[PDB]
Amino acid sequence: HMSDLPLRFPYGRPEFLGLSQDEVEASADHIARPILILKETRRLPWATGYAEVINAGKSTHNEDQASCEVLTVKVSCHYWSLFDGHAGSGAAVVASRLLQHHITEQLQDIVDILKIPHECLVIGALESAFKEMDLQIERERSSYNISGGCTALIVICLLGKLYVANAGASRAIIIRNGEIIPMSSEFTPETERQRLQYLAFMQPHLLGNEFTHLEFPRRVQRKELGKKMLYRDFNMTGWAYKTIEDEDLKFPLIYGEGKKARVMATIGVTRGLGDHDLKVHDSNIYIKPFLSSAPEVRIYDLSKYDHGSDDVLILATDGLWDVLSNEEVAEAITQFLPNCDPDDPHRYTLAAQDLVMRARGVLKDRGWRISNDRLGSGDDISVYVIPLIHGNKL
Amino acid sequence: LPLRFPYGRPEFLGLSQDEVEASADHIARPILILKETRRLPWATGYAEVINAGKSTHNEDQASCEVLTVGVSCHYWSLFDGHAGSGAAVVASRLLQHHITEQLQDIVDILKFFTEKKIPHECLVIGALESAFKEMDLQIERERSSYNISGGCTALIVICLLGKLYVANAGASRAIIIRNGEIIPMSSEFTPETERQRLQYLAFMQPHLLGNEFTHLEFPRRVQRKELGKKMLYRDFNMTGWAYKTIEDEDLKFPLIYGEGKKARVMATIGVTRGLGDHDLKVHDSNIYIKPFLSSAPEVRIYDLSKYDHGSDDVLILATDGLWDVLSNEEVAEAITQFLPNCDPDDPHRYTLAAQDLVMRARGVLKDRGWRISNDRLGSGDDISVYVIPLIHGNKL
Ligand SMILES: [Mg+2]
Ligand SMILES: [Mg+2]
Ligand SMILES: [Mg+2]
Ligand SMILES: [Mg+2]
C-alpha cells in the first residue's frame, strides 16, 4: 500500500515564491487567509504575475500547485503550469515538478522539424507528455506515496505561439483590449456526460451493477416502476419518454446540476492526473477508468496581433472562477492595470493579487464575503497574469 | 425478398412511371424540377439530377409535407442512399411518421432533492433523436421480411412553433443564406470528422477489427520496410501527432485511411452516420461495419422570430453531390446573384434557384467528362437541392 511508502517530494508552495519554511507556515492560516504574492526581488519569466491564497478551512494545506520556468529543448520554451489537487498533495506536487520534463522530452522528438503542420506536432507532444506524466505516477505508486489526484492547466510559448493545454476545471482566458478570448474549456460530468455514458454502455462491468448509464431529470423511485419518464442517453442531447424497467432504479452514473454534478456520486471533475486507486464511496468500483489524462490543446498566434501592456493571459484554478465570471475578471484587470506604471515589472503581480482578493473577500460573522454580499470562494485560489506583449513580433 | 415500397422519385414531383424512367439518363442527366403548378410548403424550390453512371437509379430521396401532431409541423427531408435504394425510399416515407409520434408524446407540454428543468426545445431535439433511432430499428426488424437495401444518410428539417430544427446524420449539408451571411446549420459525419469516436470504439472492443485492422492512424500507408523505423501516429485521445517505433500490428490496414472527404472506415464506407447498412460488411470479409455506424443525428436550431427575413434569405438543403464540387461560398454567390433576377413574388423563383445550383454542380458533357466553371470537373453524383425561403417563416 502507498501509505507504507515515503513521499516522492516534500510538500511545499511554488518554489518560485522563494518561501522559507517559516514563511510557508504563515501562509497556511485559515482565518487570515494571507494572499501570497511573488516577491518584487524574484521576477518570473515575462515578468509574469502570480498570487495565491489558501482555502477557508476544508483542508490543512493549500492543495494548489504552480510551476513556471523557461525550458530548453535540445530552443527555449516558456512554461506556466497550474495544478489543483484533491484527496492529497502527492499528485499535484509530483506533477508540478515532473510534467515539464515530459514536455521537454516529447518536444525534443520533433525539435529539428520545427527548424503535417508543426502546430499538430507540438499538440501531439503535449498530449503524449500528459499521458507520460500519468503512467509515471502510476508505475512509481509502488515506491512512493504519490497521494490523490490533480487537474492540470499548462501553457507553453514555442516559436511565437501559445499552447494552452487543459485537463480539468482550471481556466485560461486572454483579455486583449477588454475582450475575452477563451483559451480553455472545463472537463466536468456535465460537459463530458456523453463520453462517460457511452463508456458505461460499452463497458457495463465498470458499473458494478450499482449504476445505470441513463440520465433522468430526478432520482427514479420504485413507486414509478412501469410509468413514463423523461430520460437522456449517450447519443441524445435532448430528452424523450421511456418506461421505467427495474434497471432504471439503479443509481445514475451522472447526477446533479452544475458544481454539484458528480460521476458515480464521487468525482466532480473528469480529467486530470493521478487517482489510480480512487474508488466509489462504499464500493469496490474504480473511478480511474472514467477519468482521462488527455488534455485539450488550444493555440494562440502572438504574431497576429500587436499586444499592449494591459493585454494579458489569465490562468487560474476553479477557486477563482467559482465566484468570478469571465466578465468580472475582464472588468477587474482592465480597471486595475491602467493604475500602475506601464514600466513597472510588479504590475501583473499586483493585478493577480487584486483578482485573488476580489475572489477571496473578507471574513464576516457568517463567512467570507465579496462584493454585493456574495459569498467568497472557500477554495485554494492561484492566479497567473502573463503579459502578452512579451510575445510580440521581432 | 419483396420490396417494402416501390422505387421512385419524390412524390411532390408528380412523375408518371414513364417520366421517372426518362429521367434516369446517365448521358443527358436531365435536371428535374418541381413543376410550377405544383407548390411545396413555403413555395420551397426543389431540383435534382441523376448521377453520371455509378448506379442505375437516383439513390437520393426527398420527402416534403405538412405533418399534424392539433399542431402543424412543416417537414423537409433529404436522403442519400448507397449500396441500393431501398433504405432511402423506406426512410423517405416512414421517418416522418416516427417524428410525428415522438412529437405527440411531448406536444401538450409545448402548449438538495434537485429537479432538472428541461427547455421545450430539448424535448423537440429528443423527439428527433429518438425518431431517427426508431426508424433504424424498424429497418433492422423488417429487413428480414422485405428487400430493404442497403443504407442511407438522413438530413431533415421541421418547423414547429416558429423555430427551425435541422437534424443531420450523414454528409448532406444545411446552410442559411441570410443577406449575404452564411450560417451553417449542419456538420458532416465522416471518418475524418468522427475519427476519434471510431478509434476509441475499435480500441475498447478490438474484436470489431477482426484481425485485418489497426485502430491507429498514420500519415501514410505503413509498409513492411518500416519495423523499428520510428514514425508518426495518432491515437483516439490525440488531436496532434507524435512518434512511435512501428511494430508488427502497425502494418495492418488502418481503421481510418485517406485524407479529407476521401477518408474511409475499413476501406469500405466514407460516411459514419445514417440508417440501414445492418448487414454491411468489409469486402471479402465477414467483418461487420454497422457497429461503427450511428443513426444518432446532430440537431441545430434557428429561431425564425429573431430576424425579419427578405425574399432572398433562404435555407439550402443539398446532398453531397452538390457540396463536393461547390463550396458554401460559391453556393452563396450563386444564390445572391440569381435570385435578384426573379420577381420576389414569383413562386417559381426558388425552384429556379435550385435548378441553377444543380446546374452549377453538374456541368456540361463534351469529350472530357462533365465540366463546370473554370474547366473544373463537375460532380458525377446524384444531386438533390431544396431552396427554402425563410420569409414565409416570419412571425405575425
Ligand atoms: Mg483542490
Ligand atoms: Mg480548486
Ligand atoms: Mg448516394
Ligand atoms: Mg450522394
PDB file of N, CA, C and O and ligand atoms in Angstrom, chain B residues 54 60 80-81 319-321 381-382, ligand 4:
ATOM      1  N   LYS B  54     -22.712   5.705 -61.755  1.00  0.00           N
ATOM      2  CA  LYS B  54     -22.335   4.713 -60.752  1.00  0.00           C
ATOM      3  C   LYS B  54     -23.505   3.883 -60.238  1.00  0.00           C
ATOM      4  O   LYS B  54     -23.269   2.836 -59.631  1.00  0.00           O
ATOM      5  N   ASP B  60     -30.767   9.112 -54.349  1.00  0.00           N
ATOM      6  CA  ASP B  60     -31.290  10.127 -53.448  1.00  0.00           C
ATOM      7  C   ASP B  60     -32.798   9.973 -53.306  1.00  0.00           C
ATOM      8  O   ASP B  60     -33.481   9.484 -54.208  1.00  0.00           O
ATOM      9  N   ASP B  80     -29.618  10.265 -48.876  1.00  0.00           N
ATOM     10  CA  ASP B  80     -28.611   9.852 -49.852  1.00  0.00           C
ATOM     11  C   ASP B  80     -28.382   8.357 -49.672  1.00  0.00           C
ATOM     12  O   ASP B  80     -27.657   7.935 -48.766  1.00  0.00           O
ATOM     13  N   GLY B  81     -28.981   7.564 -50.553  1.00  0.00           N
ATOM     14  CA  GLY B  81     -28.800   6.130 -50.485  1.00  0.00           C
ATOM     15  C   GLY B  81     -27.437   5.699 -50.989  1.00  0.00           C
ATOM     16  O   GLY B  81     -26.766   6.403 -51.748  1.00  0.00           O
ATOM     17  N   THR B 319     -27.718  17.306 -50.948  1.00  0.00           N
ATOM     18  CA  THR B 319     -26.867  16.156 -50.707  1.00  0.00           C
ATOM     19  C   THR B 319     -25.439  16.466 -51.158  1.00  0.00           C
ATOM     20  O   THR B 319     -25.163  17.491 -51.786  1.00  0.00           O
ATOM     21  N   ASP B 320     -24.520  15.560 -50.824  1.00  0.00           N
ATOM     22  CA  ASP B 320     -23.102  15.821 -51.047  1.00  0.00           C
ATOM     23  C   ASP B 320     -22.756  15.963 -52.525  1.00  0.00           C
ATOM     24  O   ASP B 320     -21.703  16.529 -52.848  1.00  0.00           O
ATOM     25  N   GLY B 321     -23.612  15.470 -53.425  1.00  0.00           N
ATOM     26  CA  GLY B 321     -23.403  15.708 -54.845  1.00  0.00           C
ATOM     27  C   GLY B 321     -23.205  17.173 -55.177  1.00  0.00           C
ATOM     28  O   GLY B 321     -22.449  17.510 -56.092  1.00  0.00           O
ATOM     29  N   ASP B 381     -22.213  12.608 -58.987  1.00  0.00           N
ATOM     30  CA  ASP B 381     -23.117  12.027 -58.007  1.00  0.00           C
ATOM     31  C   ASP B 381     -24.555  12.426 -58.324  1.00  0.00           C
ATOM     32  O   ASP B 381     -24.813  13.341 -59.110  1.00  0.00           O
ATOM     33  N   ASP B 382     -25.499  11.715 -57.714  1.00  0.00           N
ATOM     34  CA  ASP B 382     -26.847  12.253 -57.613  1.00  0.00           C
ATOM     35  C   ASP B 382     -26.785  13.578 -56.867  1.00  0.00           C
ATOM     36  O   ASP B 382     -26.077  13.713 -55.867  1.00  0.00           O
TER      37      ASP B 382
HETATM   38 MG    MG C   4     -24.501  11.212 -52.893  1.00  0.00          MG
END
